[model samples]
Target: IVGGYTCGANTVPYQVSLNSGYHFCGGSLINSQWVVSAAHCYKSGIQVRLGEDNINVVEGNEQFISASKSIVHPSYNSNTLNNDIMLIKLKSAASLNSRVASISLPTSCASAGTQCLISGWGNTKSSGTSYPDVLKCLKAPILSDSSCKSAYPGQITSNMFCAGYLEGGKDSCQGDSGGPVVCSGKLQGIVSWGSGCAQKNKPGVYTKVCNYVSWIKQTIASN
Candidate 1:
C-alpha cells in the first residue's frame, strides 16, 4: 500500500491473504468457511492464510487453508472490471479467535467522504518492487460516484467506486487486489483495480459490496 503504515499485530483480524506459494491478494473472512475477494484474483488452487500480520515471518497465529470452491460473479466483466467480486468457500471452516475472525457485510451503501480502512501486503512503491511483509493500512475517504467517474472518464460503472487521494500517492497497489475496504466497520469495498499504484486523477477502484448483499446470502444458501 502506498503512503500507508504497518498495521499492528492482530489489529486487522478479518483480513486474509490469498496465496499459493506466496501472498498475492488480500481477502475478508466473512464467515468460518467463506471469504470475500475480487474476481480477478481467483485461482484454481488458491490457498488462504488467515490471522496473518506479517507475510514473511510466521506469527504463530496464522491458519493456512485451501479453497474448496471459488465462485466469481456471473456478470463479472474483465475488460470493464465491473461486478468484480468473488466468494471462496474454505475446504474446512476456520477456527475463529481473537486473531482470526469474520467481518460483517454492509446493509446499505456508504456515503461519500466516509473514512475507510484499506489493508494489504501489496507493493509499497508505485514503480518499484517493495512489497511489504507486514500488513499495511491506509485511511482513505470514499469519493462520490461522479467524482470517481470524472477521475476515470468512461471507466467507472455503477458496480465500481473509487477511493484515495485524487492528487496521487497512497493507494492499494498490485498484490492488494481483492482486499477489504472497511467503512463504518462493514465490508464496503473490495480492492478491484487501479490505474497504476497511486497516479494522479486515477484513484483505486473497488467493488461496491453494498449492492451484492443479497447475492452473497443467496449464493451461500444454495451453494
Candidate 2:
C-alpha cells in the first residue's frame, strides 16, 4: 500500500521512487519543510524519496531529500477514508532550486475546465486487475461545478471534485487512492474514491484541497 500512489505539481505530474528502487504513483513537496502526501504512505522509520521521474539504484542522485516524520490528519477515519491527507516533515528543508520545491495548496478553486494530471500504479483496464509495478499517469479534465453536480448528483459535495474520461479508459482507481490531483499549479484535490476502476458515467472522486485550506493551515499552525 505504501508505494501505490502518484505525484504532481500545479499542473504537472512528477515521477517518484522509493528506497527499494520501485516507482511510485506520484508525490509532491508542499512547503520548504514538508512533502504533503496521502496518509496511507505513513510508515515509521522508512524514509520517502521525492523528486525525479525515474530512479537509478547505482547513481541515486536524481532524487532529492528524504522525509522523516509523518504528520497525519488527526480526523482521519480509515473506514470512511476521511481526512486522508498528511504531511511528510522532511529531515531538512528541500532546496528551492528547480530540482526540489513544493506546490501550493489551492486556497480556492476556480471555474472548471481546469486541466490537471493523475498518476498511479493501478490497473490499466477499468476492472479485473491492477498494475503491480511501474508508474503510469494521464491527463485529467476537471468537470465544472454544475456539471459535476449534475453528473454525480447526490455524491458530489463541497469537499469533493470529480475527474476522468466519461467514456472510461483513462480513469483512476484502487492503488490511485490518496494520490494528489493538481490544477493551475495549486493543490486542487486528493484522490478519494470512485465507483469502479473505470466505470462509465462514474468519475474519480477527490477530496477538495481548496475546501480544506483553513483546516490545513490551522492544523499546521498548532503543530
Candidate 3:
C-alpha cells in the first residue's frame, strides 16, 4: 500500500530492502539465491538485506547479501516502463530460518477486484520527502484491465496491471518500487511505476508476475 500505515515486525518475512549505497527500493525474496524486483531499481552498487523489518537498526535475523548479477527483462523499455521486472542473483544462498523465507508465486492470474496487500519503506505521504525507518503495509484492490487502461490511456499493457484506491488516498510512492503485491498469499506483482504517488484515479502500476512465470523459471535455470 502506497498511502498506508506501518506494518508489524516480522509480518512480511519475504520483504527485503535494496540498497545502492543507501536503501533505494524494496524487493521480495523469491528463492534462496534470487530476489525479484523492478528493473528500474537497478543501479551500480545494488545489494539486498533480507529478513529485516526496521532499516534504522541492525537485527540478528537479518542477512545482508551482495548481488552477483542483475538480469533485467530483455525487452524492458525505460521510457514506456514496460516489462519492468528484474531478478537479482545473490552472491550466496540465503540461510532460511523463521525470519527469512521466500514468498510463493501465483499459479495463475489474480482476478480483478481481488483485495491485495503491498509493503515497502516508501513515502508515507505522496508529497512527503522523507521515508519511514520501518516497513509499511497497505491494502489495495486490483483494478480491471479496462478500468486501468482508462486511467493510463495507451500506457496499459498485458504485461502490466494496476492496483490502488481510485480516490487517491492510498498507493506506493517513488521509493516503493520493486516491492511485493500479494494476493491470496501469493506474489502477484512487483511495484513498477505510476503517474504520481497516490493521485486520484491514477492507481499504482505493477509488473504482472504471472505472465512471466516461465521466463523467470528459465532465467534461473540457465544462469
Candidate 4:
C-alpha cells in the first residue's frame, strides 16, 4: 500500500504472493488447496508463495506451490474489470500451520465507513517502480456507493467499491492486485483497479468479495 505501516511477520497468515520470479500480485488462501485472487492477474503456470512477510527473502516457513488451475469468473470483463475475482487450485495443499492458513469469506457486505485492512507488497509509491520488500498494510474504510460512483463515474459498479483517503496519498498501487481487504476479520474485498495509484478522489477500487461467496464455494465444490 502507498501509505501504510509494514506488517509484522506472519500477521497475515492467509495472504500469499503470486511470484513469477518476483511479486506479481497478492492473493488470499480460502482453503488448503485454493487461493482467491484477481482475474486480471491471471496467467498460465503461476507460482504461489504462502506465509510471505518479505517478498525478497525466504523466511523458511514459506510454502511454494504451483497453480494446478486458475478459474476466472466466467463473466469477468477484462476492460471494465467486472466480476474480477478468480479462484486458483494449488498443485498441493499447503500444510496448515500458525504461519499459513485460510481465511473465512465475509459473512455479509461491508457497510460504508467500515474500517478495513488492505495489505500487500505492491508499489509503495505511485510514481516510481519502488515495490516494498516487506508486506505493508493500511486501514482504509469502505466508501459509500454513491461516493465511489461519484469519484469513478461510469467506471464503478456494484461489484466494486472504493476505499482509502479521498484526498489521496494512500491506496493499493501496481503489483498489489488481488490483495485482501479484511473487515471484521473476514475477507471483504480484493484489490482490483483505480484511475491511478492513490490519486485524489480516486481511491483504490476493490472487488466486493461478499457478492461472490456462492460462486466461490460452488466452483470449489465442482472443481
TM-scores of all candidate predictions against the true structure:
0.98, 0.75, 0.97, 0.98
lDDT of 4 by residue, 54-135 (tens): 8888879899999999999999999999999999999999999999989999879999999999999988886777878888
Taking all chains together, the TM-score of candidate 3 against the true structure is 0.97
Instruction: Report, for every candidate in turn, its global Cα lDDT versus the true structure.
Output: 0.93, 0.61, 0.90, 0.92
Rank the models by lDDT, top first: 1, 4, 3, 2
- Residue 198 of model 3 has an lDDT of 88
Q: Rank the candidates by TM-score, best first.
A: 1, 4, 3, 2
Number of backbone collisions per candidate: 0, 9, 4, 0
Scanning candidate 2 in windows of ten residues, the lowest lDDT window is 1-10
Better of 2 and 4 by lDDT: 4
What does candidate 2's lDDT look like per residue over 1-223, in tens digits? 2212343331232323434234343456677666666665555654555544434333333545566666777776665555667666667765555555567888678447777876655566664764545455667888767766766777666766787767766677765655667777787877677777666777777777776678667766765
Error of 1 at 2 (Å): 0.2
Q: Which ranges of candidate 2 are over 4 A from the true structure? A: 1-25, 55-61, 64-66, 128-135, 144-156, 221-223
Query: Where in model 4 is the C-alpha error above 4 Å?
Result: none
Candidate 1 lowest-lDDT run of ten: 125-134
Q: Residue by residue across 1-223, what tens digits does model 1's lDDT show?
A: 9999989998999999998888889999999999999999988889999999878888799999999999999999888899999999999999999999999999999889999999999999988878888999999999988889898899988888899999988899999999999999999999999889888989999999999999999999987
